[PDB]
Amino acid sequence: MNTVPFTSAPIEVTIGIDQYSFNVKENQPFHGIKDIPIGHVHVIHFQHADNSSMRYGYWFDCRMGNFYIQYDPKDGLYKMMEERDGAKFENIVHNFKERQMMVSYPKIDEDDTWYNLTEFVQMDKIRKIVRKDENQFSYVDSSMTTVQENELSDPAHSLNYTVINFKSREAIRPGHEMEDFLDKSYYLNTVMLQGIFKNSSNYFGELQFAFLNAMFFGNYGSSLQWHAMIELICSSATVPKHMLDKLDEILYYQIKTLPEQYSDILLNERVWNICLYSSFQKNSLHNTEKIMENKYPELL
Amino acid sequence: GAMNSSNYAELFNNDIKLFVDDTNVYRVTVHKTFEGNVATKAINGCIFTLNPKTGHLFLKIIHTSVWAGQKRLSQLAKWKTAEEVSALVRSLPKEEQPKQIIVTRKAMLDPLEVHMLDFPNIAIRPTELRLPFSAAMSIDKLSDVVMKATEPQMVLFNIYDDWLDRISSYTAFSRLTLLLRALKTNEESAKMILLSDPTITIKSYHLWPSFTDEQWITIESQMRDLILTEYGRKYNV
């Protein structure tokens, strides 16, 4: 189990750790989060009391270094930083753990929710989508636009998701226009899986990472990327059976975790109705369709 | 964006454009089989591609053999239209290619857009106008070339005959759409109006009769009456 120490909490903030969250008051004796499960990526995220605008946060993996949060009063935010001095990091962590000034990551033992949401997400791929090479952790916020969004404006602060566009020459083989537009298997299996992603695990990792950024930061282009990646599979007549089975599990836990009150902005009626009821894969997502019909029948 | 009444004069500016209509590409007759079921038999069709400024009509004839062994023909018909329009554009010299293509039905947008990805500068647009181009098959000489064709074939016409010698393209298009509207609402009455007087002939190289200016005003008046009539007969007014 690992630990993220906070130097201090000078401004009142709601703090998120993965799917959990808690309120810290202005100048409360808070010094961070302990008992974080090793083995998974994690995200720690913030929403100031005074300004609910800008949710923002850091993706990290504790196996990749010792990280802490320090509030910067010039830039006005909780910043993640790396401590190089290990022995000195152990001393600080040990001192606040003795004084019980840390919240415990509150995982229930029965609970595979975070594993299920992050099964294919890897820090190395996150850092290629979020380009800031001098740090081992990645910063994301509500307002960051995607590469494809900038094509339709600061490139250093963008989300470099894999561009998917159903009416593009990449997607459509000369002389197969109708075949490739109505059945996207060429685009999925040859262009994207074999050519770009290399395997379905990397594909599923980007898809999971886009959903999480949509849900935790309300990031619109992430939401667009998550639906586009679902639609590309649902609209392909030929998909490996193992990929359909895992997709159904993946979306099932995404739909289960989504706040009920955010469904109206995080779910695209057209894509979901198409995917569950009209597409080639309309009968292949048994768990996802059952949870969608019982939780959000309004959308359908 | 869409083409409507507000931006109607844009059709007669100097930017090359084409209307594409696909309503006559896939045509069938429905009949009973010996076992009393229903079946369709396809008949020849055509894509109606028109330059509204010049009157040039590129009539691609769709022979029934193109449907042989195919499924979901109404969907294929749209893609076949887009394939043929794309092939036409590519056959034209660059200075002859359109800058816009306006489709008369919104189901053609995606098929045409996908077929034209190589031409990012050509704008593909729908329209809010309810243009009567489906009545092109009521023009006798056009119906005849379609029905006689034994193979795929492109024929070139000028749908304004020589009218541009005497009137602007805005008035020629208004005349054409009034004639086609009439032919669509009541073909028989419309055709009687056009041909009643035997001393007004259709030249061998024309589609319509050789009316004088005064006679075109009379003719145009008679077509309006027909359309208003049928609209009463139809709505009892």
Ligand SMILES: COC(=O)CN1CCN(c2nccs2)CC1
């Ligand atoms: C040279 O400057 C410094 O050493 C200042 N930092 C000391 C280490 N601090 C950390 N808190 C927890 C783990 S590491 C944050 C402040």
